[PDB]
Amino acid sequence: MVLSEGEWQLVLHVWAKVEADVAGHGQDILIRLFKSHPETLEKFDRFKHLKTEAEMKASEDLKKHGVTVLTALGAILKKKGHHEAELKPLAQSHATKHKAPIKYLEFISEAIIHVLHSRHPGNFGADAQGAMNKALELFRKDIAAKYKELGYQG
Ligand code: HEM
């Protein structure tokens, strides 16, 4: 698929606001994922012991991982579709080591959209949400194709 320039501008305009507080957004997104879809927590040996939202919010480790996650995603989005090199090591680790199914990438996608909608209503109207959804769908499609080349699931 291909996004237009005007779609990429909508994506990077809201992402510029996210980047004012990467750690806070990273925490909100992972906590949303883990509360919405508790099954995903089981993939993280590092975090699986966390019982409550309160425990998640107080974890320095979870916050650090949120920063890692959003920094990797932010680098991919700023490539505006030209992200083949950034995607390769990410696909390899998530297919072979972490075993992160496409369905769980859908779930974190939903979590990202929820948090941007909650925190940035003025810059995340319907057209901006549509552009962010397309960017994330593009990401998932390209990662699924690499999963296939690497010998993991769809
Ligand atoms: C926007 C989607 C995601 C991005 C950009 C992302 C990014 C990253 C990065 C950069 C790392 C560290 C380096 C590496 O191991 O590749 C990592 C590790 C990891 N990811 Fe993801 N990830 C995403 C989605 C997921 C999902 C949905 C799952 C599983 C439900 C997952 C499970 C893991 C695990 C288990 C680790 C290792 C954590 C640890 O023990 O240090 N990832 N991810």
**Which CA distances in Å does 63 have to 1, 25, 82?**
33, 9, 28
Q: Rounded CA gap, 10 and 108, in Å? A: 20
- Residue 85 DSSP one-character state: H
How many other C-beta atoms can be found within 10 angstroms of the C-beta atom of residue 100?
21
* Half-sphere exposure at residue 94, Cβ-oriented, CA atoms within 13 angstroms: 22
Q: Rounded CA gap, 16 and 49, in Å? A: 33
- Residue 152 DSSP one-character state: S
Residue 124 and residue 14 in contact, taking contact as beta carbons nearer than 8 Å: yes
Q: Rounded CA gap, 113 and 130, in Å? A: 10
End-to-end CA distance of the chain: 18
Residue 46 and residue 59 in contact, taking contact as beta carbons nearer than 8 Å: no
69 CA to centre of ligand 1 in angstroms:
7
Q: Rounded CA gap, 61 and 8, in Å? A: 32
Q: Rounded CA gap, 27 and 47, in Å? A: 13
Q: Is 112 exposed, middle or buried (0-12, 13-18, 19+ CB in 10 A)?
A: buried
At residue 5, what are phi and psi to the nearest 5 degrees?
-60, -40
7-45 in b/e burial notation, b at 16+ Cβ within 10 A? bbebbbebbeebeeebeebbbbbbbbbbeebeebbeebe
Q: Which atom of ligand 1 is nearest to the CA of 108?
A: 27
Elucidated via: X-ray
Q: Which two tokens mark 126?
A: 């319907």
27 CA to centre of ligand 1 in angstroms:
14
Fold of the domain spanning 1-154: Globin-like (1.10.490)
98 CA to centre of ligand 1 in angstroms:
7
**Cα-Cα-Cα-Cα dihedral of 44, 50, 53, 56, to 10°?**
-70
Cβ–ligand 1 distance for 73 under 6 Å, the answer yes
Instruction: Please list, in sequence order, all residues whose beta carbon lies within 8 angstroms of the beta carbon of residue 70, skipping any fewer than 6 positions away.
Output: 18, 22, 25, 26, 29
What resolution in angstroms does the PDB record give? 1.7
Q: Rounded CA gap, 43 and 99, in Å? A: 8
Domain ranges in the chain are: 1-154
